[PDB]
């Protein structure tokens, strides 16, 4: 049987599907290391919010990253939004097998589950015996619409991909978050800290503590308000518009007409994020804030945020102390750091 | 499977490392948060002389007693665990199968032919296997690296963890473990270990074990019947200990003057005469002419200023191995005592290490 360890010598794809991009991201470890890296940019319209619409213009994107990327690992884990996933602890009679529970829970779940039964997709695992009554188990149920998982199934099956771990983003995020420790001062038990990702076209602030999330709040502010600006002002296209945020090249008159408001309406609305938070519950500050997405990429935004809130604030980096491929550049990965961290969670996954 | 899905938290849970050898039961458990490692938990327990001789277990109801007591003085709570077998209890083999064949398909016919490609008998064997690729010879076949050993060094191990509610997840062999912990002597070492050739001395009570280590994988591996009983020996009978007076005294101290020059100092001889037979076995035998370090290991390798005789007879930069350098330690765990038995607990260590690579 598989007691058996006679052979020291299995590593799988960080996939983030998001609305504008792929990311994918190869991880080793021993000290982790980067295999690979790449990102592929997204037809519009084909992920229309955490969800896959264009089935096969997503293939070829992802096609495309795994090129870009250039690795021969054909298993990937992806992740859905927690907006999907349904987490309750219900009772269960004790001395059932895993595969007893399994298949009652394939016959009675739409009773523990609002989902219909025919589209439920069930997660389980016993946390142990009832302290009230050993005739019970207590079994944490964690479920999503089966729709969620085969879209993604199928495409990454255009790919010549396979869904090995079909994982939760909120939890992915804490995996990446806790690679954060070092660049901290203390490890992430110590610290209730705010994460705030600035997508493209969604901001989320994602309250840590102790590497748990107690809050996770969104809202329709994103980097593609500056990218619309830089077409605009300039005749340049969307992908001219891109790079010329990470490039520059911009005429002179870019910091003070576009750049500077943009990080005023970003900093307005990081502080719009954490005074939502603070009248929701009982935490009256955070320790830090950890800037993270693409957007957080704009050079001294941690320090100007850090300024205007008061709360100390640094750009999310997992690849700090992380080794490097000889293969993978140095410099690109690092300017792409904070948004890879959905990435990178699903990459750690495949440690466990 | 029908289960492709993480939806629920993992536990990521750990494993303990258990080092079941001949004269004593070692325990530890490891936890990791930042890249710094802590102990959580580890205890000793001594075996009854005779329960384990050799590399087997012969008194299974006496082992699972003493490892189980182990636990309580370790006081932890969990109940599954890591086992290691000797390196020469493993045959390693390269054959070529045919290709086109599942993991699945192919574990069911190696059931069967075992017995062709290794020399255990087929009921007692134990075997694992690894696809390494198309075969350059034929690409019609495939690679596959065998590993293997006699059932009943498994299953005994599996027995007596029963025995003391512990269940054997893995079972791993010493000499990879040892490469686990000998990783986390970088700090010490003064270089990466990746770069670094050296040879690990591994002295315990009655076995004495050289492994030599070429960019943390090793290459040479050479057994002797020497070992620190030969001067626990010699403590019982010059003055009338017994096993236990004479080792606690080995450690504590206390006994009379002319230990030292009588007792003490043969036996550091006889340690360093060993250990150069044994390197010059190995350049004699090998491609390599020199080494840049040598490991001390076991917990013989705790006598006083003994690393320095034996960097200076050999003319090789010489360490004792302590795992537990850059490590945090839990409240609960004795700082003290845990730096005294800290060389013999690189196979213990390298058990608890498996759950973090
Ligand atoms: N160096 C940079 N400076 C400024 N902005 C950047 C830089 N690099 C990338 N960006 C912006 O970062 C955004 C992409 O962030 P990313 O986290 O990939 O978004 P997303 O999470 O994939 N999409 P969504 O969450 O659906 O809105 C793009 O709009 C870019 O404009
Ligand atoms: N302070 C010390 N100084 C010198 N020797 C010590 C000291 N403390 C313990 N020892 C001895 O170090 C020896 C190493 O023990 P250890 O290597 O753990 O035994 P073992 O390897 O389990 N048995 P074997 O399989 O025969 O090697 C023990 O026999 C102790 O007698
Ligand atoms: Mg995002
Ligand atoms: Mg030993």
Not at 68 to 93: D, F, P, Y
Not at 172 to 199: C, F, K, M
Request: net charge negative; with cysteine; proline share 3%.
């Amino acid at each position: 049987s598989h007691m058996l360890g006679l052979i020291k010598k299995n590593t799988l794809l960080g996939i983030d599907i998001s609305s504008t991009s792929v990311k994918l991201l190869e991880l080793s470890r021993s000290r982790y290391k980067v295999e690979a890296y790449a990102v592929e940019p997204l037809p519009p319209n084909a992920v229309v919010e955490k969800n896959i619409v264009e089935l096969e213009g997503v293939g070829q994107a992802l096609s495309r990253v795994l090129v870009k990327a250039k690795t021969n690992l054909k298993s990937a884990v992806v992740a859905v939004a927690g907006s999907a996933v349904i987490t309750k602890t219900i009772e269960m009679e004790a001395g059932l097998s895993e595969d007893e529970l399994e298949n009652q829970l394939k016959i009675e779940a739409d009773q523990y589950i609002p989902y219909p039964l025919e589209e439920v997709a069930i997660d389980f695992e016993v946390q142990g015996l009832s302290a009230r009554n050993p005739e019970r188990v207590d079994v944490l149920l964690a479920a999503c619409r089966k729709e969620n998982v085969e879209v993604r199934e199928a495409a990454l099956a255009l790919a010549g991909l396979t869904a090995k771990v079909v994982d939760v983003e909120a939890y992915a995020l804490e995996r990446s978050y806790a690679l954060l420790s070092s660049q901290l001062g203390a490890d992430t038990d110590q610290l209730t800290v705010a994460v705030v990702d600035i997508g493209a076209t969604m901001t989320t602030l994602s309250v840590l503590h102790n590497g748990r999330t107690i809050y996770t709040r969104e809202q329709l502010f994103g980097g593609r308000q500056l990218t619309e600006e830089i077409q605009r002002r300039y005749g340049l296209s969307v992908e001219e518009a891109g790079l010329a945020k990470k490039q520059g090249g911009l005429p002179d008159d870019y910091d003070s007409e576009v750049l500077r408001p943009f990080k005023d309406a970003v900093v307005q609305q990081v502080s719009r994020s954490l005074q939502f938070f603070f009248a929701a519950g009982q935490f009256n500050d955070v320790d830090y804030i950890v800037l993270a997405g693409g957007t957080a990429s704009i050079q001294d935004l941690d320090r100007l945020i850090q300024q205007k809130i008061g709360t100390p604030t640094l750009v999310a980096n997992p690849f700090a102390d992380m080794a490097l491929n000889g293969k993978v550049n140095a410099g690109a990965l690092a300017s792409d750091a904070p948004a890879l961290m959905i990435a990178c969670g699903l990459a750690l996954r495949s440690f466990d």
